[PDB]
């Protein structure tokens, strides 16, 4: 609505399924949080220190 | 089983796994030996530390 950019839905609840089957460890690993999702549109990342 | 060659995969809490290189198979071969089987007899494996 303004430069702001907000997503709407998740496109891997399938695999966070998936973990859930084999163990509480694997669905609160770290990795699991890592799972990406893509950018949500024209545009680019930056780093900033 | 002194210098023979094993093969072997880590298994991690998550259940993912990596392969151990030789050089892994062999450190745990020359401290878990001992307790491996042999013909005619059975062995129990211990924790290994």
Known sequence: ?49 | YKNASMQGLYIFADMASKDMTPEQSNVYRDNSYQQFDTNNVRRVNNRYA
């Open chain 1, 1 to 49: 609505w303004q430069s702001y950019r907000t997503r709407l839905n998740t496109l891997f609840a399938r695999q966070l399924v998936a973990r859930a089957t084999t163990g509480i460890d694997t669905i609160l690993s770290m990795e699991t949080q890592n799972i990406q999702e893509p950018q949500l549109g024209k545009g680019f990342y930056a780093t900033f220190v």
